[PDB]
RNA sequence: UUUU
């Protein structure tokens, strides 16, 4: 399964993003591209020491700064089910 | 890639910030982006017992991936990771 | 709207202030563009040390902001 | 392609990869690609008591961008042929 | 880029992002700012630390080239 | 481009610099022209009219509706 | 054309300064446009921090990834 | 805008 296929399938769903600088972003994935640039909606930004928190209506994140994304198990399940039916 | 050799098996990723995360390799691409499922992080230290954090589905951007090891199930069964101590893995310095 | 590089192109011959991602700045007369600056002052914004340059080629990779 | 080709000739021989996080891993080179990503088999971490994390890993993928060095026995390198290949690569790139 | 002609063959100061300085005659320059110098002196904390008879400097490290 | 004109935005750069300003232009590489810029120091300083280089951006968000909140996560 | 300097060092001993307070002296047998290199009979000097100590190691054959290279000179 |  390709990673960008999974990322595109989590559009519309909650997501957790951690950046190289150590900040984390919790929000709904509104859109993404093959650069892994993200636009998120209704976001909580957490500073690196877990000290301070901001609410952002939406935000844009450059993909080159992402360390990793956390995605719900059901998204992975959905993509696997669709690919295994597309096989037939 | 040679990573195709590891598909659908338990794998242990060392990232550029020194973290250790284990999980099932569900996919990768030519930049070494990875999908791990049923993943968890292991924090081995010298001062305290090993911590295990559950992570679920984990998409790792390849830029941040240093190593991907295939975990040998028998070797890992022989090890009691609870009582294991070790140094923090250093950060990658470019 | 306005186009960043058209604004910078407008700045040729005028004074430009450049802010790096690191704590360094340069201020000089923009010659062209990686940018060439003339009669430049380099500022280390942590140590406070300042240095002068008659003319220099500034690598563009580390520049954050350009300010007319 | 010069160093990708060079590393292919070292497949099946023992190498030590020093990484930019100061870990070094010894093992049999099994695979290499255009990025100089490398796959080692039957690895042993050089300072294993410092880094017990890979005690259950035998096969290992290393991303090419995190390599500092690969060092290898001179016995499997023909430096006359290597230098000639280098000159032909430079000429091809002219 | 009339800077090049004005600078190739004359003494230059090269500052790396790390802060280490190299002074020497500039043999050659390219788009990534890879340099070749002819008798380089290296300065760390401002002190002369090494002398190289010729030097290739990899451009990703170069912060600037300034004329002397 | 998956992404404010004349609205005030906040931007974060690799290396940590953090600024706000009114978006007055942009291009496809995501260079920005921001006016009335203020840099948040690591307190503020005022930079006026700035061109930001898109390659150094990490984050862009609108200022309207952005607020500091207390910890929202269940301990 | 800068790389022509390194062309003149093929099969000659070079000094290489690397990021991370590391230095190499060895015989250049191959390089490419990234400054990937293979050195034969190489000595590495690692400086540990005024220096606290230096560590010297010898390698019969050594591939060096180019992105660590700061400069290349005669020894 | 991920491995020079």
Numbering used by the authors:
A (entry chain D): 1 to 88
B (entry chain H), D (entry chain B): 1 to 94
C (entry chain E): 4 to 36, 41 to 75
E (entry chain F): 6 to 73
F (entry chain G): 24 to 26, 31 to 69, 79 to 111
G (entry chain C): 9 to 57, 66 to 91
Please give sentences taken from the publication describing this entry.
Eukaryotes possess eight highly conserved Lsm (like Sm) proteins that assemble into circular, heteroheptameric complexes, bind RNA, and direct a diverse range of biological processes. Among the many essential functions of Lsm proteins, the cytoplasmic Lsm1–7 complex initiates mRNA decay, while the nuclear Lsm2–8 complex acts as a chaperone for U6 spliceosomal RNA. The Sm family includes the Sm, Lsm (“Like Sm”), and bacterial Hfq proteins. These proteins share a conserved “Sm fold” consisting of an amino-terminal alpha helix followed by five antiparallel beta strands that form small beta barrels that assemble into ring-shaped hexamers or heptamers. Here, we elucidate the molecular basis for Lsm-RNA recognition and present four high-resolution structures of Lsm complexes bound to RNAs.
We crystallized the Lsm2–8 complex bound to UUUUU-3′-OH and UUUUU > p and determined their structures by X-ray diffraction to resolutions of 1.9 and 2.3 Å, respectively. In the Lsm2–8 complex bound to the UUUUU-3′-OH RNA, the 5′ uridine is bound by Lsm4, and the next three uridines are bound sequentially by Lsm8, Lsm2, and Lsm3. Uridine binding involves stacking and an extensive hydrogen bonding network as previously described. The last uridine with the 3′-OH group is disordered except for its 5′ phosphate as evidenced by weak electron density for both the ribose and uracil groups. Consistent with this, Lsm2–8 still binds to oligoU RNA ending in 3′-OH, with a Kd of 100 nM. For example, Lsm2–8 binds to telomerase RNA (TER1), which has a stretch of 3–6 uridines ending with a 3′-OH.
